[PDB]
Amino acid sequence: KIVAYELKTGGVLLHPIFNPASHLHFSIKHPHTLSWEYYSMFQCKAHLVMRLIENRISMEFMLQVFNKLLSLASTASSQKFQSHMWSQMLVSTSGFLKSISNVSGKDIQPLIKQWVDQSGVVKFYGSFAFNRKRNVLELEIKQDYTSPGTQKYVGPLKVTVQELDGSFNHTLQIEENSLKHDIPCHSKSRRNKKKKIPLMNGEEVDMDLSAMDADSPLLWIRIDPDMSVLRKVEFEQADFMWQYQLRYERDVVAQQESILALEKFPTPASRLALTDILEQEQCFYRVRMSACFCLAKIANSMVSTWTGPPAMKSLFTRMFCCKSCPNIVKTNNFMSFQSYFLQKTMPVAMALLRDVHNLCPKEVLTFILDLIKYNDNRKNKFSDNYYRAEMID
Amino acid sequence: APIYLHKMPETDFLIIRTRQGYYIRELVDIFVVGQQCPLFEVPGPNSKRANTHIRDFLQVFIYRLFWKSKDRPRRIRMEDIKKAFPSHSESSIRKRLKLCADFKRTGMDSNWWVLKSDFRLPTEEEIRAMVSPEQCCAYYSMIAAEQRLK
Amino acid sequence: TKDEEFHREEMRKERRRIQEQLRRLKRNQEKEK
DNA sequence: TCCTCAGTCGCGATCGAACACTCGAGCCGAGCAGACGTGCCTACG
DNA sequence: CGTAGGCACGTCTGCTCGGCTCGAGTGTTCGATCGCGACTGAGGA
C-alpha cells in the first residue's frame, strides 16, 4: 500500500520540520489540511517504521520503551501541580529517541534520518548469475533512485539463498557505486544421494529436482526476506525457482510473491505448482485464495493448449461436492473457516476463464448456476450471506 | 560455567590502586567458577577465521582512526597504525588502506593517507557489525595458547 | 636452526644494490636525453 | 509307526554412513624493480 | 661572490612466485539389516 502510494504521488513525510514537502498539493503543517488518503498512509507508514525500529532494537527493549513512557505518564497523571509535571504525559520525537537510547544504549539516528526525515521508499532490481568455476553466486542489485517517489539506500541488505545444502542468510553492503555482489555457494551432494533438503525452519522435505539445473545448487533467492526496509523488489529468477519457492517455502510472503511472479510464466509446470498449492491444506489459506486467481490468469493465457476440463472445476468437485454426484454441491457446513473462504473464492476466480472466442465458457457458467440452485443452508450454524454474495460476484 | 558462591576470607580486602592513590573496598561474595562449557569456537593458528579476524580488526582500527581525524579531508598517519600493529608487515596495512585512502606525497596533506572523496566512511553500527568482542576474546585465547605451546 | 639458517649486513648489501641500480637508471636517462 | 510345521542359525548380498585422496580457489608473505618525493652536494654567470 | 643541475634514503606501487588452508568431489571400507536354505524340537495321522 505505501510503496504504491509513494510511487504514485511524492511521498509521506513523518516528522516534518517547520514547506518541507512541496511535491504534493496540500500543506502538511496541520492535520486539517491533509488529504484523507495521506492521513491513512501516514498512519500506515508510522507503524511500519516502528516495526523497523523493533528490527534494529529488539522487541523486549521496545516494550520497555513503551512501558517507560506509560510509567512517566502515570506518575505525571496523579500530581495536582498545574503542568509542572503534567507535560510528562506528552511525548515528543526527541524524548522518544532519548528513552530508546536510555533503555538500549544504541541510537537509531541513521534509521530515523533515512525512514522518517527523508520521505521515500526504495526500489530494488536484482538479477543473479551462478559462476560454476569458482562456485559463487554473483548477484546484481541496482536501484531506481531517479523516480519521483524514490530514495537511495546505502545500508546493509539481507538476502536468503536456498541451496541444496539448506537455507543460508547473507548480508550485503550496498554502497552507491556497488553493483555486483559475489556470495559463496555450498555443495550439491544432496543430488548425489537422495537426501532431504533442509528448509528455512528446522524441517526438511523431499523435492523433485528434475526441473533444477544440473550445475547450480541454488534453488531460490530472496532479496530482503524480513521486509527490513521500505522496499519494492523486482527479482529475476528462473521459473522453476519460483515454483520451488511456491511449493516448499515456509514463509507466506515468499509464497505470495512467487504466485505474483508465476503469472509471467504460463508453463504447465507452473499450473502444476499452483494446483498443488490449491489442493494442499496446511498451506495458509490466503495463499490458496491467491493461487485461484493466478491459476485463472495462467489458464486464460494457455488456451489452445489446455487439455482437460476448465481450471479448478474438477478440484472444486473433488473438494466441495458429493462423492456420488459431481455436479451437486454438498450442503453448506461452514465450520472449518478455511475451506469456507476457499469455497467462496474459487468460483469467483473460475468465472474469469475465457474461451478462444473471448467468451466465458458455458461449462463454468452452468457450474456456477448449479452452485446457486443446489445451495442448502438449513444445517450449518452460520449464515450464508457472504457465500451467496460471492456467487453473485 | 557452573559457579559456586563462597563467603570471603575474614582477612582479605580489595585495594584498587590508580595513579593518584590507593582505595579500599571490602568484599563479601566470591564465586568459584567450575570447568567452562565453551559456546564459541576458538580458531586455530593460520586458520581462515584467524586471518579474517586479523584483517577485520585492522580494518576496524583504521576506520576508527579516520573517524577520530579532525581534518576536513579525513587523514591519518601510517606510523600510528604501525605503533598499534607492529608485527604486521606494512604490505598488509597498505592493502587495507589501498581501498578507502590514498597517499599524498607533495603539497598539502603531504605524508598523510587522506580518505577518498567517493568513499563513504561506515557508520558506528556498521563498524560494530564488522568485529564482535567475543571474536577478539577467541583470537586472544588462540594467540596466548600459541605462545604457551611455543 | 642457525646451522640450517646458512641480517643488518644483508640489508646494507640491498641498499648498495639499490644505489647501483639507481645510478644505472640515471645513466640510462642520460643516454636517452 | 509316523508327518509335516513353527521358531531360529549361518551365510551371501546389497546398502548407507563414514573415511582417505585429490585438486583447485583464494589469500598472504617475501622479493624485486621502480617511481615520487625530500634533502645534500657541484659547474656556470 | 651567487646560483641552478646531479647523488642517497623513505615510502609507496605493482607484478611474480611459492606456500598454506579448506571445502567440493570422488573412490573405498565396513557394520547393518534382508533374504535363502537349513537346523531342530514339536503336537496331530
XYZ file of C-alpha atoms (C1' of nucleotides) in Angstrom:
666
model
C 0.000 0.000 0.000
C 2.674 2.532 0.943
C 5.010 1.785 -1.943
C 2.048 2.160 -4.324
C 1.068 5.490 -2.746
C 4.603 6.895 -2.521
C 5.453 5.962 -6.093
C 2.078 7.362 -7.182
C 2.416 10.825 -5.611
C 5.579 12.103 -3.970
C 5.890 10.580 -0.533
C 4.722 10.547 3.072
C 6.963 12.592 5.375
C 6.818 11.533 9.000
C 8.176 14.286 11.289
C 8.483 17.364 9.068
C 10.326 20.453 10.252
C 8.768 23.900 10.013
C 7.339 23.992 3.101
C 9.153 20.721 3.878
C 7.087 18.711 1.371
C 6.360 20.716 -1.778
C 5.773 17.788 -4.138
C 2.120 17.500 -3.116
C -0.853 19.794 -3.423
C -1.663 20.432 0.261
C 0.230 21.671 3.295
C 1.367 19.189 5.909
C 1.635 21.749 8.727
C -1.790 20.928 10.186
C -3.908 17.752 10.348
C -6.957 19.516 8.920
C -5.272 20.376 5.631
C -4.118 16.822 4.936
C -5.804 14.705 2.325
C -7.571 11.695 3.799
C -5.511 9.232 1.762
C -2.386 10.978 3.047
C -3.657 10.622 6.618
C -4.274 6.902 6.094
C -0.845 6.373 4.539
C 0.695 8.459 7.333
C -0.596 6.069 9.994
C 0.407 3.091 7.838
C 3.996 4.297 7.344
C 4.289 5.211 11.020
C 3.560 1.694 12.192
C 5.876 0.171 9.578
C 8.733 2.459 10.666
C 8.066 1.357 14.257
C 8.414 -2.249 13.094
C 11.767 -1.208 11.592
C 12.863 0.287 14.936
C 11.891 -3.037 16.530
C 14.045 -4.786 13.922
C 17.082 -2.715 14.875
C 16.428 -2.687 18.642
C 14.808 -5.909 19.843
C 11.152 -6.296 20.802
C 11.675 -6.598 24.563
C 13.619 -3.322 24.600
C 10.811 -1.787 22.532
C 8.182 -2.850 25.056
C 10.457 -1.466 27.772
C 10.482 1.903 25.938
C 6.684 1.893 25.836
C 6.451 0.915 29.500
C 8.834 3.738 30.437
C 6.677 6.262 28.556
C 3.499 4.935 30.205
C 5.130 4.941 33.645
C 6.311 8.545 33.318
C 2.794 9.469 32.202
C 1.139 7.658 35.110
C 3.415 9.224 37.701
C 2.569 12.513 35.989
C -1.168 11.766 35.897
C -1.610 11.757 39.689
C 0.110 15.059 40.592
C -2.047 18.186 41.115
C 0.607 20.733 40.050
C -0.815 22.548 37.067
C 1.564 21.144 34.404
C 4.790 21.442 36.385
C 4.602 17.679 35.870
C 1.565 17.166 33.566
C 3.757 17.610 30.463
C 5.441 14.299 31.094
C 2.243 12.910 29.629
C 3.182 14.493 26.280
C 5.696 12.610 24.135
C 7.982 14.156 21.525
C 10.399 12.741 18.981
C 13.488 13.788 20.949
C 12.060 12.342 24.157
C 11.180 9.083 22.402
C 14.668 8.743 20.910
C 16.201 9.622 24.283
C 14.152 6.934 26.036
C 15.227 4.445 23.346
C 18.863 5.428 23.915
C 18.331 5.085 27.667
C 16.996 1.554 27.537
C 19.250 0.151 24.798
C 22.470 2.138 24.531
C 22.125 2.212 20.737
C 20.749 5.262 18.977
C 18.685 4.879 15.828
C 19.564 8.278 14.278
C 20.626 6.804 10.886
C 17.364 4.837 10.715
C 15.408 7.903 11.854
C 17.265 10.041 9.317
C 16.543 7.616 6.491
C 12.964 6.496 7.015
C 11.415 9.364 8.964
C 13.053 12.657 7.943
C 13.525 11.831 4.249
C 10.171 10.718 2.688
C 10.892 7.969 0.187
C 10.866 4.238 -0.449
C 13.496 2.224 -2.310
C 13.253 0.140 -5.486
C 15.468 -2.912 -5.991
C 16.123 -4.624 -9.327
C 18.009 -7.870 -8.833
C 19.391 -10.487 -11.181
C 21.787 -13.320 -10.462
C 24.302 -15.459 -12.306
C 25.911 -18.636 -10.983
C 29.653 -18.982 -11.596
C 30.227 -22.734 -11.899
C 34.026 -22.459 -11.990
C 34.556 -20.612 -8.641
C 31.224 -21.903 -7.200
C 29.940 -18.407 -6.436
C 26.635 -16.603 -6.863
C 27.053 -13.189 -8.494
C 24.091 -11.012 -7.582
C 23.436 -7.760 -9.421
C 21.274 -5.321 -7.454
C 20.616 -1.886 -8.919
C 18.319 0.800 -7.553
C 15.976 3.149 -9.387
C 16.599 6.364 -7.465
C 15.522 8.850 -10.154
C 11.788 8.133 -9.957
C 9.764 10.853 -8.164
C 8.948 8.779 -5.089
C 12.261 7.011 -4.544
C 15.409 7.474 -2.492
C 18.825 5.830 -2.381
C 19.613 3.072 0.103
C 23.204 2.658 1.288
C 22.810 0.411 4.315
C 23.149 -3.353 4.655
C 20.767 -5.752 2.950
C 19.865 -9.312 3.895
C 19.498 -11.960 1.192
C 18.404 -15.559 1.772
C 19.611 -18.256 -0.629
C 18.101 -21.736 -0.552
C 20.628 -24.196 -1.958
C 20.596 -27.995 -1.793
C 22.553 -27.918 1.463
C 19.985 -25.666 3.136
C 18.962 -22.058 3.661
C 21.747 -19.528 4.217
C 21.480 -15.820 5.010
C 23.989 -13.271 3.713
C 24.407 -9.582 4.482
C 25.338 -7.381 1.518
C 26.745 -3.864 1.758
C 25.055 -1.845 -0.948
C 27.046 1.399 -1.266
C 26.290 3.930 -4.068
C 28.885 2.603 -6.554
C 28.067 -1.103 -5.844
C 26.608 -3.383 -8.480
C 27.995 -6.937 -8.317
C 27.941 -8.894 -5.036
C 29.704 -12.258 -5.042
C 28.436 -14.590 -2.326
C 29.737 -18.164 -1.880
C 27.746 -21.294 -2.643
C 27.797 -24.692 -0.958
C 27.930 -28.272 -2.269
C 25.477 -30.265 -4.378
C 25.911 -33.597 -2.599
C 22.196 -33.864 -1.803
C 21.687 -34.536 -5.502
C 24.297 -37.327 -5.474
C 22.373 -39.208 -2.810
C 18.666 -38.674 -2.427
C 18.608 -36.923 0.919
C 16.005 -34.463 2.158
C 16.833 -30.769 1.585
C 16.673 -28.746 4.831
C 14.421 -25.707 4.840
C 14.381 -22.272 6.479
C 12.892 -23.796 9.623
C 14.309 -26.960 11.156
C 12.379 -29.359 8.938
C 13.402 -30.993 5.665
C 11.396 -32.193 2.672
C 11.638 -34.322 -0.450
C 11.938 -32.142 -3.542
C 11.601 -33.202 -7.164
C 14.939 -31.998 -8.528
C 14.209 -32.813 -12.178
C 13.478 -29.183 -13.054
C 16.629 -27.833 -11.394
C 19.779 -27.057 -13.338
C 22.488 -29.681 -13.140
C 25.330 -27.231 -12.484
C 23.790 -24.903 -9.881
C 22.933 -25.973 -6.321
C 20.764 -22.971 -5.537
C 17.005 -23.486 -5.510
C 15.748 -19.955 -4.858
C 16.948 -16.499 -3.800
C 15.025 -13.894 -1.794
C 16.271 -10.313 -1.567
C 15.283 -8.732 1.786
C 13.105 -11.553 3.143
C 12.235 -9.994 6.513
C 10.944 -6.727 4.933
C 13.565 -4.813 6.903
C 13.406 -1.801 4.556
C 10.529 0.033 2.878
C 11.156 -1.529 -0.495
C 9.786 -2.881 -3.764
C 11.804 -5.819 -5.082
C 11.917 -6.929 -8.728
C 13.974 -10.118 -8.782
C 14.632 -12.127 -11.947
C 14.675 -15.804 -11.039
C 14.037 -18.727 -13.337
C 10.507 -20.161 -13.439
C 11.473 -23.404 -11.701
C 12.943 -21.360 -8.849
C 9.618 -19.549 -8.491
C 7.821 -22.904 -8.487
C 10.148 -24.321 -5.816
C 9.652 -21.143 -3.786
C 5.898 -21.520 -4.130
C 5.883 -25.164 -3.075
C 8.482 -25.663 -0.358
C 8.920 -22.275 1.306
C 7.980 -21.733 4.942
C 7.200 -18.031 4.529
C 3.841 -16.728 3.351
C 5.174 -13.529 1.795
C 7.527 -15.559 -0.394
C 4.688 -17.854 -1.461
C 2.625 -14.762 -2.298
C 5.424 -13.157 -4.300
C 6.023 -16.426 -6.159
C 2.312 -16.572 -7.021
C 2.616 -12.974 -8.215
C 5.684 -13.810 -10.323
C 4.287 -17.035 -11.796
C 1.747 -15.091 -13.869
C 4.540 -14.264 -16.327
C 5.422 -17.956 -16.802
C 2.352 -19.816 -18.135
C 4.170 -23.162 -18.494
C 2.312 -26.323 -17.336
C 4.816 -26.821 -14.506
C 3.535 -23.571 -13.000
C -0.045 -24.855 -13.401
C 1.009 -27.994 -11.555
C 2.648 -25.854 -8.839
C -0.448 -23.711 -8.259
C -2.733 -26.752 -8.380
C -0.578 -28.494 -5.773
C -0.813 -25.346 -3.646
C -4.604 -25.295 -4.045
C -5.048 -28.969 -3.056
C -2.805 -28.515 -0.021
C -4.258 -27.981 3.369
C -1.526 -26.886 5.858
C -0.865 -24.066 3.424
C -2.021 -20.666 4.666
C -5.473 -20.027 3.262
C -4.778 -16.579 1.821
C -2.079 -18.122 -0.370
C -4.556 -20.593 -1.861
C -7.068 -17.783 -2.399
C -4.386 -16.008 -4.449
C -3.484 -19.199 -6.300
C -7.087 -19.394 -7.541
C -6.772 -16.077 -9.394
C -3.237 -16.856 -10.569
C -4.462 -20.190 -11.956
C -7.313 -18.389 -13.729
C -4.888 -15.947 -15.387
C -2.495 -18.732 -16.425
C -5.414 -20.770 -17.796
C -6.567 -17.780 -19.850
C -3.075 -17.378 -21.274
C -2.593 -21.041 -22.343
C -5.814 -21.525 -24.286
C -5.401 -23.784 -27.358
C -3.036 -25.805 -25.133
C -5.306 -26.704 -22.178
C -6.100 -30.421 -22.224
C -8.985 -31.381 -19.970
C -11.767 -29.535 -18.154
C -11.631 -25.852 -17.163
C -9.342 -24.920 -14.298
C -10.377 -25.602 -10.668
C -13.653 -27.317 -11.678
C -12.505 -30.877 -11.079
C -10.746 -29.575 -7.979
C -13.978 -27.961 -6.757
C -15.898 -31.198 -7.319
C -13.136 -33.130 -5.547
C -13.058 -30.825 -2.518
C -16.571 -29.424 -2.023
C -19.085 -31.646 -3.862
C -20.604 -35.060 -3.180
C -18.741 -38.262 -3.999
C -21.748 -39.810 -5.717
C -22.960 -36.677 -7.541
C -20.232 -34.462 -9.052
C -22.463 -31.604 -10.188
C -24.460 -31.393 -6.938
C -22.624 -29.378 -4.300
C -22.525 -30.597 -0.706
C -24.896 -28.967 1.755
C -23.309 -25.996 3.453
C -21.259 -26.696 6.569
C -19.079 -23.640 7.165
C -17.441 -24.783 10.399
C -13.884 -25.092 9.051
C -13.365 -21.369 8.157
C -10.582 -22.133 5.669
C -12.408 -24.306 3.188
C -15.302 -21.867 3.618
C -13.137 -18.999 2.362
C -11.615 -21.159 -0.368
C -15.043 -22.450 -1.407
C -16.459 -18.955 -1.657
C -13.415 -17.642 -3.550
C -12.973 -20.450 -6.073
C -15.958 -19.812 -8.446
C -15.153 -16.077 -8.393
C -11.765 -16.876 -9.915
C -13.229 -19.687 -12.037
C -15.553 -17.207 -13.747
C -12.567 -15.323 -15.185
C -11.962 -18.260 -17.524
C -12.313 -17.350 -21.195
C -12.510 -19.473 -24.350
C -10.733 -18.926 -27.720
C -13.674 -16.628 -28.640
C -13.080 -14.416 -25.529
C -16.422 -15.528 -24.048
C -16.731 -17.271 -20.700
C -17.354 -20.991 -21.314
C -20.838 -22.388 -20.809
C -19.328 -25.156 -18.674
C -18.251 -22.735 -15.925
C -21.362 -20.560 -16.094
C -23.554 -23.672 -15.836
C -21.396 -24.829 -12.910
C -21.890 -21.509 -11.102
C -25.646 -21.613 -11.732
C -25.790 -25.163 -10.356
C -23.848 -23.938 -7.327
C -26.554 -21.319 -6.883
C -29.540 -23.732 -7.375
C -28.349 -26.590 -5.175
C -27.392 -24.350 -2.235
C -28.837 -25.661 1.040
C -28.044 -23.803 4.266
C -30.562 -25.279 6.713
C -27.923 -27.320 8.543
C -24.926 -25.147 9.394
C -24.730 -22.854 12.406
C -23.514 -19.958 10.236
C -25.151 -17.616 7.768
C -24.903 -17.830 4.002
C -24.959 -14.165 3.010
C -21.294 -13.786 2.101
C -21.168 -17.052 0.142
C -24.282 -16.119 -1.843
C -22.932 -12.596 -2.360
C -19.716 -14.092 -3.732
C -21.849 -16.273 -6.011
C -23.405 -13.103 -7.438
C -19.871 -11.704 -7.816
C 30.169 -22.337 33.539
C 28.900 -23.520 36.938
C 29.687 -21.059 39.714
C 29.578 -21.635 43.461
C 29.095 -18.853 45.989
C 31.578 -18.803 48.866
C 31.982 -16.215 51.567
C 35.172 -14.191 51.526
C 38.016 -14.755 53.991
C 37.851 -12.553 57.049
C 41.303 -11.060 56.383
C 41.167 -10.068 52.710
C 40.227 -6.622 51.399
C 40.402 -5.234 47.864
C 42.843 -2.417 47.097
C 42.217 -0.512 43.873
C 45.370 1.404 43.027
C 45.451 4.117 40.387
C 47.983 6.826 39.630
C 46.557 9.116 42.321
C 46.280 6.791 45.305
C 45.077 3.594 46.913
C 41.413 2.871 47.584
C 39.986 0.044 49.693
C 36.743 -1.919 49.493
C 35.648 -4.900 51.445
C 34.389 -7.945 49.613
C 31.783 -10.353 50.936
C 30.913 -12.577 47.930
C 33.332 -14.680 45.904
C 32.262 -17.276 43.363
C 34.297 -20.277 42.275
C 33.871 -20.957 38.583
C 33.961 -24.576 37.520
C 35.033 -26.043 34.207
C 33.773 -23.889 31.354
C 31.438 -25.216 28.674
C 32.561 -23.263 25.588
C 29.919 -21.749 23.328
C 32.339 -20.012 20.936
C 34.923 -21.841 18.850
C 38.476 -20.556 19.211
C 40.077 -20.549 15.738
C 43.285 -22.364 15.018
C 46.562 -20.726 14.103
C 46.839 -19.716 10.427
C 43.159 -20.606 10.006
C 40.866 -18.810 7.598
C 38.804 -17.458 10.507
C 42.033 -16.358 12.211
C 43.327 -14.367 9.230
C 39.837 -12.970 8.641
C 39.709 -11.698 12.220
C 43.171 -10.113 11.940
C 42.192 -8.340 8.706
C 38.823 -7.182 10.079
C 40.371 -5.932 13.334
C 42.944 -3.904 11.389
C 40.180 -2.503 9.172
C 38.049 -1.503 12.170
C 41.037 0.231 13.782
C 41.715 2.101 10.523
C 38.077 3.231 10.245
C 38.050 4.434 13.844
C 41.260 6.377 13.247
C 39.595 8.005 10.252
C 36.564 8.895 12.390
C 38.817 10.461 15.039
C 40.545 12.679 12.461
C 39.601 16.370 12.744
C 40.940 17.401 9.296
C 38.085 18.210 6.837
C 39.557 15.762 4.282
C 39.911 12.983 6.914
C 43.568 11.948 7.043
C 45.626 9.536 9.139
C 49.302 8.693 9.532
C 50.808 5.296 8.776
C 53.032 5.069 11.845
C 50.017 5.342 14.139
C 48.913 2.027 12.640
C 52.494 0.786 12.816
C 52.530 1.651 16.520
C 49.281 -0.239 17.071
C 50.084 -3.307 14.949
C 53.898 -3.606 14.911
C 54.009 -7.292 13.983
C 52.132 -6.561 10.760
C 54.093 -6.277 7.563
C 53.401 -2.888 6.025
C 52.158 -4.549 2.825
C 49.065 -5.728 4.704
C 48.432 -2.282 6.194
C 48.828 -0.717 2.756
C 46.418 -3.347 1.423
C 43.834 -2.205 3.954
C 44.483 1.449 3.110
C 44.523 0.885 -0.669
C 40.793 0.913 -0.931
C 39.377 3.821 1.203
C 42.516 6.021 1.239
C 45.302 7.446 -0.877
C 48.782 8.702 -0.070
C 49.616 12.357 -0.662
C 53.344 12.904 -1.165
C 53.510 16.593 -2.092
C 51.611 19.799 -1.470
C 49.038 19.934 1.282
C 48.313 16.764 3.312
C 51.828 15.554 2.490
C 52.867 12.200 4.024
C 49.235 11.625 5.034
C 46.736 8.989 3.931
C 43.697 11.058 3.079
C 40.268 9.486 2.766
C 38.921 9.093 -0.755
C 36.172 11.564 -1.589
C 33.857 8.933 -3.073
C 34.326 6.588 -0.109
C 31.535 6.698 2.458
C 33.089 6.029 5.844
C 30.925 3.390 7.579
C 28.629 4.402 10.416
C 29.110 3.320 14.024
C 26.717 0.370 13.832
C 28.382 -0.979 10.668
C 31.801 -0.825 12.352
C 30.264 -2.618 15.331
C 28.842 -5.248 12.986
C 32.294 -5.825 11.466
C 34.029 -7.309 14.547
C 32.359 -8.680 17.716
C 34.133 -8.642 21.110
C 33.785 -12.412 21.525
C 35.779 -12.920 18.322
C 38.521 -10.792 19.879
C 38.451 -12.962 23.013
C 38.694 -16.113 20.887
C 41.646 -14.622 18.996
C 43.373 -13.665 22.252
C 42.865 -17.197 23.569
C 44.380 -18.591 20.366
C 47.479 -16.404 20.445
C 48.029 -16.953 24.187
C 47.822 -20.711 23.681
C 50.146 -20.395 20.680
C 52.711 -18.696 22.971
C 52.353 -21.290 25.789
C 52.711 -24.230 23.320
C 55.632 -22.471 21.540
C 68.391 -23.649 13.413
C 71.346 -21.301 12.877
C 73.223 -24.254 11.362
C 70.402 -24.530 8.809
C 69.989 -20.748 8.655
C 73.091 -20.548 6.459
C 70.687 -9.608 8.572
C 71.925 -5.995 9.014
C 74.833 -6.787 6.633
C 72.339 -8.184 4.067
C 70.185 -5.007 4.420
C 73.310 -2.882 3.784
C 74.059 -5.062 0.708
C 70.471 -4.485 -0.531
C 70.947 -0.704 -0.035
C 74.185 -0.861 -2.081
C 72.308 -2.827 -4.793
C 69.538 -0.172 -4.878
C 72.154 2.620 -5.164
C 73.854 0.813 -8.069
C 70.502 0.216 -9.817
C 69.513 3.913 -9.409
C 72.890 5.058 -10.813
C 72.408 2.697 -13.785
C 68.870 4.140 -14.323
C 70.277 7.720 -14.225
C 72.947 6.678 -16.788
C 70.105 5.246 -18.959
C 68.234 8.589 -18.647
C 71.416 10.471 -19.707
C 71.820 8.102 -22.713
C 68.163 8.721 -23.728
C 68.467 12.545 -23.448
C 4.975 -96.317 13.473
C 4.580 -91.505 11.524
C 4.411 -86.329 9.449
C 4.903 -82.132 8.198
C 5.212 -77.495 10.885
C 6.844 -73.279 13.585
C 10.774 -70.716 15.562
C 15.540 -69.747 14.792
C 21.028 -70.219 12.981
C 24.765 -69.430 9.270
C 25.986 -67.201 5.085
C 25.739 -64.480 0.690
C 24.165 -59.919 -0.575
C 23.462 -55.236 -1.051
C 23.262 -50.524 1.220
C 24.042 -46.430 3.900
C 27.433 -43.941 6.635
C 31.869 -42.608 7.094
C 36.857 -42.009 5.756
C 41.145 -41.297 2.693
C 42.921 -38.949 -1.513
C 42.956 -35.155 -4.942
C 42.616 -30.522 -6.800
C 41.807 -26.021 -7.395
C 40.309 -21.198 -5.458
C 41.958 -17.726 -2.836
C 44.687 -15.268 0.353
C 49.219 -13.920 2.421
C 54.095 -13.111 2.759
C 58.544 -12.392 0.512
C 61.105 -10.466 -3.128
C 62.437 -7.264 -6.658
C 62.348 -3.293 -9.943
C 60.903 1.310 -9.896
C 58.675 5.881 -9.192
C 57.673 10.175 -6.456
C 59.232 12.845 -3.342
C 62.876 15.174 0.186
C 67.498 16.629 1.459
C 72.691 17.096 0.046
C 76.199 18.181 -2.964
C 78.926 20.628 -7.688
C 79.960 23.772 -12.938
C 78.459 28.240 -14.779
C 77.249 33.575 -14.520
C 80.688 36.277 -4.751
C 75.982 33.903 -6.103
C 73.095 30.204 -8.473
C 70.644 26.092 -10.699
C 71.828 20.853 -12.271
C 73.173 15.972 -10.438
C 73.566 11.701 -5.841
C 71.446 8.920 -1.172
C 67.031 7.284 1.594
C 61.883 6.627 2.605
C 57.666 5.171 1.470
C 54.627 3.523 -1.700
C 53.311 0.782 -6.411
C 52.816 -3.351 -8.905
C 53.799 -7.677 -10.564
C 55.574 -12.673 -9.770
C 56.070 -16.778 -7.303
C 55.602 -20.222 -3.639
C 53.068 -21.978 0.308
C 49.003 -22.941 3.252
C 44.033 -23.713 4.219
C 39.665 -25.566 3.054
C 35.958 -27.458 1.019
C 33.987 -29.937 -3.042
C 34.197 -34.094 -5.415
C 35.261 -38.930 -5.976
C 36.582 -43.627 -4.768
C 36.995 -47.371 -0.756
C 35.814 -49.965 3.654
C 32.849 -51.859 6.996
C 28.907 -52.635 10.084
C 23.631 -53.166 9.467
C 19.891 -55.373 8.068
C 17.239 -58.763 4.089
C 16.554 -62.891 2.143
C 17.516 -68.042 1.397
C 18.306 -72.697 2.799
C 18.676 -75.312 6.569
C 18.541 -76.938 11.687
C 15.714 -78.775 15.190
C 12.253 -79.552 18.664
C 7.082 -80.281 18.354
C 1.602 -81.641 18.511
C -1.516 -84.229 15.399
C -2.164 -89.025 11.063
